[PDB]
Amino acid sequence: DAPPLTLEGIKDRVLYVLKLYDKIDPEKLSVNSHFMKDLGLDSLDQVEIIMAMEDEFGFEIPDIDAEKLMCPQEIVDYIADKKDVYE
Amino acid sequence: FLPSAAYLTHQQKVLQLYKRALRHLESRCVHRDKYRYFACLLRARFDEHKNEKDMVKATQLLREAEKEFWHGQHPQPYIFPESPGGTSYERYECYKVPEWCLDDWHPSEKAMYPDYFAKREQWKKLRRESWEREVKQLQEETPVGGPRTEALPPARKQGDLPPLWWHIVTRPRERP
Amino acid sequence: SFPKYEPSRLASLPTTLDPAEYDISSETRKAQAERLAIRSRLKREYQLQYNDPSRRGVVEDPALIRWTCARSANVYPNFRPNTKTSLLGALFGIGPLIFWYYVFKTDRDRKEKLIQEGKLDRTFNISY
Amino acid sequence: SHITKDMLPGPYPKTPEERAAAAKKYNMRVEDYEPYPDDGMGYGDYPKLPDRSQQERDPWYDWDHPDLRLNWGEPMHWDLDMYIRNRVDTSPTPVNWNLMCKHLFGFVAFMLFMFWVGETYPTYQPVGPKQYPYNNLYLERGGDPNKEPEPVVHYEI
Amino acid sequence: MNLFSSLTLVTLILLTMPIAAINFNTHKFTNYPLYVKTTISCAFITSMIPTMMFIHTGQEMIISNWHWLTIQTLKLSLSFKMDFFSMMFVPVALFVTWSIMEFSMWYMHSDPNINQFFKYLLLFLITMLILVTANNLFQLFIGWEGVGIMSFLLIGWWYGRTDANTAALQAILYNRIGDIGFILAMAWFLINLNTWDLQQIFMLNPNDSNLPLMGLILAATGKSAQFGLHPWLPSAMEGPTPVSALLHSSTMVVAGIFLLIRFYPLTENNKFGQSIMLCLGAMTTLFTAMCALTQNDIKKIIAFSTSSQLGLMMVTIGINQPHLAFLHICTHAFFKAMLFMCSGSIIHSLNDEQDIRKMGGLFKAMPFTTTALIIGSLALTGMPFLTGFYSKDLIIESANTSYTNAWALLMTLVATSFTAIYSTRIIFFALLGQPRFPTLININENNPFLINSIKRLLIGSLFAGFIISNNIPPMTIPQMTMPHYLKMTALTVTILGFILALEISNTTHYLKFNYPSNTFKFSNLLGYYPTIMHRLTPYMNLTMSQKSASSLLDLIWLETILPKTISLAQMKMSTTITSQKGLIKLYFLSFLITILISTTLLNFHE
Amino acid sequence: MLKYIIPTMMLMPLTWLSKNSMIWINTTLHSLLISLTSLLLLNQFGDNSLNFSLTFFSDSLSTPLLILTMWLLPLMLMASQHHLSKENLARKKLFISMLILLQLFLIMTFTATELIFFYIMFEATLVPTLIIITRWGNQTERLNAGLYFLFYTLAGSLPLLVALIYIQNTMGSLNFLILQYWVQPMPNSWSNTFMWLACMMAFMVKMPLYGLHLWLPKAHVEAPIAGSMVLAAILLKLGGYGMMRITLLLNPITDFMAYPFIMLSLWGMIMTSSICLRQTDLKSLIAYSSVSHMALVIVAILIQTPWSYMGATALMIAHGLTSSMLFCLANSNYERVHSRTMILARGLQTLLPLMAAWWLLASLTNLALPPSINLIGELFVVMSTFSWSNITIILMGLNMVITALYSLYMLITTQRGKHTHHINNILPSFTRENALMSLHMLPLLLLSLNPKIILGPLY
Amino acid sequence: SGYTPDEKLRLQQLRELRRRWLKDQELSPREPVLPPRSIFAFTHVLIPVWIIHYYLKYHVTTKPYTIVEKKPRIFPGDTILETGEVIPPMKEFPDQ
């Protein structure tokens, strides 16, 4: 029992649950858009978003990674490192 | 206790405390709605005396926070079924056969699998060809005599693959 | 609000309330950086000697060999007979021996004098 | 090969050269190296460690030996064989240690005490004994077909 | 009867073909699971007959052949007896394990080491059968250690996973404690009664029944996960799922009290022993009851539940009522086989979460296993009046109507209330709440194998307890004459537990943030027993083996006492004698002192 | 039996005048033929033992041990390649001929008429094993190990000769038949105590007991596989055999002076099981296992029940087979990685899949596999010692628990949990290792079927 | 904070290499593998029954002290099959 993933679908689901969140906009919601650069939201709220990622996908990401995600592209890249779905 | 640096940060210590407190609060609180309530309560508790610019008072109240947190820990946390100490923890290690093997098959089994073995052979030639001169020129010239980090710069200038790539790229899938 | 979590040799002390991760002066910063340089040098040497495609044999850790040779052969030197070590040896070797010897004295004298009286439970006691 | 200077003869005196060569051979900081000291218990001049090392060394560091907690270069602990996971869990307990042992022993003493109080205070019900018909199952108890038949009978009440 | 003996021996022998078949394969099989399933079904259709012939007939017989070591006044052959409980207990185990074959076809469907798995599982069944059929006690010992080591292998199936081999080591160590108890009983039997043969044992029942009974108690607590020797049971739940189902549903978990059932004329006497029986079982029951609250691992929850049921069976052995305990074995076996199978179906269908944290709303998420789990946890404590009514409630009726401890009855009281309340808790946290598990769902249980397995075991859970309880001869005097609040008291305890857990769930709905009042700690950190013992006693022997054995008795001190003194003495005598510098006057003065010391000191002429 | 001695004299020059790549098959084949030829031995019946000549007589104590020796030879003779294939042809011939000469003195030792001949062939057994382990020890202290071995076994076995000449000139001839008929109780003097302590102490040293077992770990970690298996199985069980024969005389004082040997045996068995629980260097674990089982053998000898003797000889044969198998497993691990340690080579469930079956089966045979001969021996010894004392069952069962424990840890340290993924030089499982394991364990299960052979003369 | 761009470059090269490796592991030549080259239940339920029923009659009953019953139960309303006599039944019940 193991349905394999896809790159586009996991990007869509990450951007989906980001768009569910409050203090950002659905207007300019880019995968290639950082957090401290243009959005200005908190590092505290950044790790809240990290926790939302983990509670969707059911595994920890460690602390030395947790400093250095900062954007949804590297989020999708690191969960693609974990689950390793590269057809 | 980290690969790149030596000390975390003050803020990184506070951040790890926040993540572990949020995790232990998950494990304490069922039904998810009062959990969202108490999570906003703890977010406000960090909002109480966040923005001070002291050092000694900051680390002192952080110590007292650690004391009242080690009191307020849940004893059997809901760790995910991939965590160390969890439920899987290399659950499928039975089929995590390493990739240095499989050369010692009988060649009848190589006649069974022609295409994968020929492509692994050209991977191996790619491994051996781009190995000594450039990669070891980087790893013998480009750092200081003290390395002072566990990272490595890529093959950033001209040519081949970034150094020491083999047993990190060529690894099992972690899920057969 | 808390009894400060007394540690023991069994119960460990967690990494939060150290409290040595608080007044981290630049001497200790320098020491942690030196320890990081140590681990960096070790893992760099290992990863050099490890990823070689022409390499066939084992990695030959001298730390494991050093621990084994210290644990087995490098015990008998260095030795000095201390009075505390000698008394602890004669207590941990002869104490239980004379203890079980006294109890075998006791049980055998009781059983042999009981069967010399003849009042054993030997209604049938074949498989001796 | 294997140089003789990678064994460990001799103890910790004297303090410049022994600690120097220990930092050399053990790959450690000089003040981080600690002799035991020597007390006639062998031990050579082997390093003293922080001595827990297994519920320490948190797993997300991703070192080289994952089920050994090594790094391929370490002072391995002298008593490492007791330390490894699957052998002894040296975790920080959630509560205490003395509070744990005292309340467990108190619970055991309480339960065994009430067991002895039960052993002097049985249950019984308003029921007499069983009036077995034939001399309390004689000839189907121990036997004696001609030795001792005994006159004893119940009277109906 | 040639028919009767022949059919029992072929129920033995049909569980011998598949192991040697795949060891004689030298090919590639595909439907070896189907082969094992159909031969277990064949074993069941053979073993259904002799029970029917038994209750129709009686004729309670023993078979024995292939003797070896007729050495002294005994002889031991492969020797087993088909009697009442040892005959009707076989088809229950066969049918339960047939369901487990189905559930293992589903559960391990994507893991191609299934052939070695079914070989280990079949050999475990064979060893358990050889245990439960025997009267020659050495064959009991064979089956005893064999199911211990097959339990080791099935727990440590997943190599890797330090939890697994840790658990398996703990289990096998506590089973060696069972082994020392059993061999003490064996030694007393050999030396005093010339053999270990229950015919001769029950022909000559002595009044000194103290040392073998203590051996029996130690074997019982080593096998049946009792107070102080329990914690290998949740540790054993750390294995795979149908592994745990077979391992602690029917097989391997009742075998300790099975021996005490088997020795019932031996334990007709020595009321000191039955007092120890019931007090020990009450201790297990309430201890695992108080530990059983506040736990969030479903396998460990059902482990605590079956430990409590084993405690009630120990009570049932303590009162002179062995046949109620055997009926509880059968009902409990069907019951928690079905229960483990249901919960494992849920967990494997829902991405191996397994935890009550992030479990809640699974009502109307697929309704088949929800019906299964509510029939299970309702049949727990015996909703009147069902299969689980009969066993547990005749247990408590005979317990209250006896010369009991007057503390053990209170233990059964409070622990029956406690198993009612965690039954309510496991239902409410498993099905009824809000659905808490992440998105990208795999919500399905469509499988013909699984629906037929759950199907046939709940159908067994409806009828077979009543069917077994009816057509058996009452080997005891039934009490059946109770005052007020002595027969209704089971229903009273279960309904008050339902109300108490109902208001616990009402407080669970609220938002309060209650504080850990340290009964929380004592109930959720396992009663502190695995923590304290597994940090104390491994530290003891491993510290003494370092200090005393390694560095203090054998190596360094023995090499100083025997070789060193001799070798250094000879070295010093050499360096004193042969280190004479080469003079001449010294040698002739040595001649002179030799002549003088031979003449005048120790004379030789006189 | 002379028809068993003389083909071994014929088997020696076979090795010499066979040529290159021709010695090996001839020696292996013909020693297997001798295994058939002395499988034909067991004619023993009823009242007496099978007794043919002034030269020879064989008990059913000597029968399974002699069959075990000649069966263990060709298995070993195949086992000792891969470490002398690169050596010289002449040195290879010297090695194989030394093994054959050692077998010859083993058979001479087992079928001795008078105990003087037993002593001569006893130290004749002693001498070539030294040469084997010293010429091919393959570790830096084979010097110290051979030195300890020869000095302990001589200087413990030295007053035995004096005591045998004393029994010669006090009671007529020393043949075991007439000594069986001309025994008489020699009561509590002090010279009787010294003489008993001399004979029993010599064979104590041969077992070894706990008091001076220290030569035995070095003699198994610093020896090749052939001398290791010969040493452990045939030499230690030969010491037990010799004590079994000499203990027929000197019955009246063993109740007075047999107490402290029982004590040191039991407490040293417990301490040996403790010390093997923790150590590294996997090869040594089998050696301390041997010390534990032979302490159990010694307890079984000094209590004097026929139950005890039958369990003793069962434990002898079973631990001989188990320890030789487990030595060859450790040799296979040492051929894979050049470590000899315990924590380095890990994993090996993935790699070498049917090697796991043999490790599991070996740890089962150490674990007292429930119909195995090992459990039969341990069980009957526990029976006889619980007859001897009602309180010593505590130490026996504590030995049982720790025995299961260290056998299981010996299993799961090496072949459980994680492959270290840096070794990458192991060859796949050879047919040689699996062939040697099928040669080890099929006879053990056959003897587990009908064990009326392996029970001793008090059957 | 975040990555240094050297780590970004290194990691994107490892993106390309790791994707190429895991795609190369995905084989499909349309053929991964290639090989170069009632009565069932009848035997498996009759044949051990035949062998054991043959074994349990002749040899094992010529061994004398072999398999033995616990005797059937006879009641005061029964009769013996082989010899043949009834048992005189029990007397009056009354005041049941």
Short mmCIF file of N, CA and C in Angstrom, two decimals, chain F residues 71 75 78-79 225 229 321-332 354-359 361-362 429-445:
data_model
loop_
_atom_site.label_atom_id
_atom_site.label_comp_id
_atom_site.label_asym_id
_atom_site.label_seq_id
_atom_site.Cartn_x
_atom_site.Cartn_y
_atom_site.Cartn_z
N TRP F 71 35.52 -38.66 12.84
CA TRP F 71 34.61 -37.88 12.02
C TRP F 71 35.03 -36.43 11.95
N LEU F 75 36.55 -33.28 8.03
CA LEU F 75 35.90 -31.98 8.11
C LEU F 75 36.90 -30.88 8.37
N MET F 78 39.45 -30.42 5.41
CA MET F 78 38.92 -29.50 4.41
C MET F 78 38.83 -28.08 4.94
N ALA F 79 38.55 -27.92 6.24
CA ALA F 79 38.34 -26.60 6.82
C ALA F 79 39.58 -25.72 6.82
N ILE F 225 42.31 -22.60 12.82
CA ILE F 225 41.02 -23.24 13.03
C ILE F 225 41.16 -24.72 13.36
N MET F 229 39.89 -26.40 16.90
CA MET F 229 38.82 -27.38 17.04
C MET F 229 39.32 -28.67 17.69
N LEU F 321 30.67 -30.96 19.21
CA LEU F 321 30.13 -30.62 17.89
C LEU F 321 29.76 -29.14 17.78
N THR F 322 29.09 -28.60 18.80
CA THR F 322 28.62 -27.22 18.77
C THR F 322 29.79 -26.24 18.72
N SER F 323 30.79 -26.45 19.57
CA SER F 323 31.94 -25.55 19.62
C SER F 323 32.79 -25.65 18.36
N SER F 324 32.89 -26.83 17.75
CA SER F 324 33.64 -26.91 16.50
C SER F 324 32.93 -26.18 15.37
N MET F 325 31.60 -26.36 15.28
CA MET F 325 30.79 -25.61 14.32
C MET F 325 30.95 -24.11 14.51
N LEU F 326 30.90 -23.66 15.76
CA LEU F 326 30.88 -22.24 16.02
C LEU F 326 32.25 -21.62 15.81
N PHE F 327 33.31 -22.40 16.06
CA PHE F 327 34.65 -22.02 15.63
C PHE F 327 34.72 -21.82 14.13
N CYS F 328 34.10 -22.72 13.37
CA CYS F 328 34.19 -22.55 11.92
C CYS F 328 33.36 -21.37 11.43
N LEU F 329 32.27 -21.04 12.14
CA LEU F 329 31.55 -19.80 11.85
C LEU F 329 32.40 -18.57 12.11
N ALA F 330 33.13 -18.57 13.23
CA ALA F 330 34.01 -17.45 13.52
C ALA F 330 35.15 -17.36 12.52
N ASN F 331 35.61 -18.51 12.01
CA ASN F 331 36.63 -18.50 10.97
C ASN F 331 36.09 -17.95 9.67
N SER F 332 34.82 -18.24 9.35
CA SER F 332 34.21 -17.66 8.16
C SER F 332 34.10 -16.15 8.27
N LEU F 354 21.69 -17.64 3.75
CA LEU F 354 21.60 -18.94 4.39
C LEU F 354 22.71 -19.16 5.41
N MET F 355 23.69 -18.26 5.46
CA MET F 355 24.61 -18.22 6.59
C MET F 355 23.86 -17.91 7.89
N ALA F 356 22.77 -17.14 7.79
CA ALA F 356 21.94 -16.83 8.94
C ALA F 356 21.31 -18.08 9.52
N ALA F 357 20.96 -19.04 8.66
CA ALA F 357 20.41 -20.30 9.15
C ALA F 357 21.43 -21.04 9.99
N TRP F 358 22.70 -20.97 9.62
CA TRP F 358 23.70 -21.70 10.39
C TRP F 358 24.05 -20.98 11.68
N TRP F 359 24.09 -19.65 11.67
CA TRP F 359 24.28 -18.92 12.92
C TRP F 359 23.12 -19.14 13.87
N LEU F 361 21.16 -21.77 13.93
CA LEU F 361 21.18 -23.15 14.40
C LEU F 361 22.28 -23.36 15.44
N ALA F 362 23.42 -22.69 15.26
CA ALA F 362 24.50 -22.80 16.23
C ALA F 362 24.13 -22.15 17.56
N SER F 429 28.67 -16.22 -0.19
CA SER F 429 28.77 -17.43 0.60
C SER F 429 29.28 -18.60 -0.24
N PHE F 430 30.47 -19.09 0.10
CA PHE F 430 31.07 -20.19 -0.63
C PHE F 430 30.30 -21.48 -0.39
N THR F 431 30.49 -22.43 -1.31
CA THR F 431 29.96 -23.76 -1.07
C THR F 431 30.78 -24.51 -0.03
N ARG F 432 32.01 -24.07 0.23
CA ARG F 432 32.85 -24.73 1.23
C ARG F 432 32.27 -24.58 2.63
N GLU F 433 31.90 -23.35 3.00
CA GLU F 433 31.37 -23.09 4.34
C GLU F 433 30.06 -23.83 4.56
N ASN F 434 29.17 -23.80 3.57
CA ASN F 434 27.90 -24.49 3.68
C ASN F 434 28.08 -26.00 3.68
N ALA F 435 29.09 -26.49 2.96
CA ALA F 435 29.41 -27.91 2.97
C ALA F 435 29.90 -28.34 4.35
N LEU F 436 30.79 -27.55 4.94
CA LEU F 436 31.28 -27.81 6.29
C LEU F 436 30.16 -27.74 7.32
N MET F 437 29.18 -26.88 7.11
CA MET F 437 28.09 -26.81 8.06
C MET F 437 27.13 -27.98 7.92
N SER F 438 26.90 -28.43 6.70
CA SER F 438 26.14 -29.66 6.51
C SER F 438 26.88 -30.87 7.05
N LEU F 439 28.21 -30.83 7.05
CA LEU F 439 28.98 -31.89 7.68
C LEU F 439 28.92 -31.81 9.20
N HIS F 440 28.78 -30.60 9.75
CA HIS F 440 28.66 -30.48 11.20
C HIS F 440 27.30 -30.94 11.70
N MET F 441 26.22 -30.41 11.12
CA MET F 441 24.95 -30.40 11.83
C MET F 441 23.99 -31.53 11.49
N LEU F 442 24.09 -32.11 10.31
CA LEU F 442 23.35 -33.35 10.06
C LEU F 442 23.71 -34.50 11.01
N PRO F 443 24.98 -34.76 11.38
CA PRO F 443 25.21 -35.79 12.41
C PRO F 443 24.66 -35.43 13.77
N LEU F 444 24.63 -34.14 14.12
CA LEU F 444 24.09 -33.74 15.41
C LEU F 444 22.59 -34.01 15.49
N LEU F 445 21.87 -33.78 14.39
CA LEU F 445 20.45 -34.06 14.39
C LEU F 445 20.16 -35.55 14.30
#
